[PDB]
């Protein structure tokens with residue numbers, strides 16, 4: 001429909017999740033989460049109607065070295081399939097070069113998730129040993145962070161990870177978490193702190209974040225390069241942050257019921 | 261002894277019991293809304309008890325396994341002493357009445373047919389006489405048991421096709437039935453209770469409809485363990501709410517007042 005903004009997003013708790021009973025629901029009402037609420041807020045402030053669509057290949061966005069084709073939500077923006085991406089999408093240099101980003105709406109860093117009791121306290125710890133395997137999501141800013149790093153500990157970790165057998169890489173966050181939970185403390189998962197903290201507060205309460213974050217960065221709302229929508233969306237993010245509304249949303253979707 | 265909090269077993273089935281929008285930050289009864297949620301509040305008020313709403317663990321209404329003879333679902337919760345009362349769209353049936361107490365019905369209904377708009381079917385007879393349009397029911401519950409037990413030729417004929425169709429024509433939840441009708445381009449019809457049918461008919465994208473008359477006539481009742489002293493009070497409360505017109509007000513509130521398909 002004319003004037004309808006196509007929003008690309010991704011299923012990632014608690015950002016975007018299928019509602020209970022979603023099978024009888026339709027359109028935007030199928031989904032719930034932090035980014036679903038944020039999308040509604042941004043839309044309201046900028047005065048547009050929008051349609052949420054889950055990205056086809058289920059990926060965030062990387063560029064194939066061979067074909068130099070972008071995939072994921074980044075791909076959707078770059079090739080004109082979506083008008084805006086509203087998701088836990090990390091602002092990185094290589095992405096900033098091909099799409100526009102708002103100022104960040106949330107902060108985060110790469111962190112370590114272990115099964116409770118695992119004798120690891122830091123990235124350094126992981127790097128100095130081999131009994132406990134560790135990996136990341138097979139595509140995204142986290143894996144790219146280790147692949148590009150010239151920092152000693154991270155470089156070591158990467159040279160280990162890219163070769164380890166069987167693969168320490170997983171296809172989804174849920175899959176990474178599952179692997180931590182099944183491996184009796186022999187697998188540690190490298191993921192962004194926001195997801196780590198969410199999962200930490202959920203049953204069966206057998207995982208935990210250890211150490212400080214390995215880096216500091218932010219999620220931004222992304223639009224195609226030079227899109228006129230960019231300006232309004234950026235001012236809207238800043239406005240919502242200043243009203244304390246971004247904080248309210250974090251507190252709502254990371255609200256601790258006491259499962260753990 | 262002293263008064264205890266009443267444990268209410270119920271089930272997530274729209275618009276009887278639904279998650280409230282901000283459920284993620286709410287606790288206890290406050291997480292839920294809908295017809296049965298309001299009904300529980302009214303019943304508790306007139307009866308003078310405090311209560312806790314609990315969603316049934318296995319997500320079933322109640323059936324007895326032929327093998328083990330164990331009751332599952334909300335009926336099971338009551339039978340095995342896990343809950344004190346069930347407040348849900350629970351169909352009053354012979355096999356259940358044998359093992360639990362039921363109030364007089366708070367709502368009437370009948371098994372019905374839901375089609376995607378434009379499907380060339382207007383009756384169960386129509387369905388039975390063709391094969392192009394598949395049809396099914398929820399894989400457990402009073403609707404499936406109706407066909408499985410029917411001695412009436414048309415329904416026996418529908419059951420004979422349904423039990424052996426492939427892929428399976430049964431669905432696990434009402435939502436799954438609705439999705440199957442909506443996505444199958446007129447090649448799937450869903451057999452469900454007229455109450456759910458009339459509700460979905462008023463929801464976006466307004467692409468379904470109830471066709472034909474009802475296949476039977478029955479009621480939903482409040483259930484309690486057999487012999488429970490709570491039964492008497494709750495029954496009278498249901499009768500009172502009906503005669504005051506409160507039950508009619510509630511159905512209009514949840515079915516029609518905020519229907520999404522026009523006026």
Ligand SMILES: N[C@H](C(=O)O)[C@@H]1CC[C@@H]1C(=O)O
Nearest residue numbers: 060088089090140141142143
């Ligand atoms: N924010 C990341 C991204 O933009 O690529 C996502 C979250 C999983 C994935 C990752 O951590 O690599």
Ligand SMILES: N[C@H](C(=O)O)[C@@H]1CC[C@@H]1C(=O)O
Nearest residue numbers: 321349350351401402403404
């Ligand atoms: N009222 C029914 C019951 O008590 O079993 C429920 C509603 C879905 C299921 C059905 O239609 O069979």
Ligand SMILES: [Cl-]
Nearest residue numbers: 019020021022
């Ligand atoms: Cl669901």
Ligand SMILES: [Cl-]
Nearest residue numbers: 263264265266
């Ligand atoms: Cl108590």
Ligand SMILES: [Cl-]
Nearest residue numbers: 366367368369
């Ligand atoms: Cl009625």
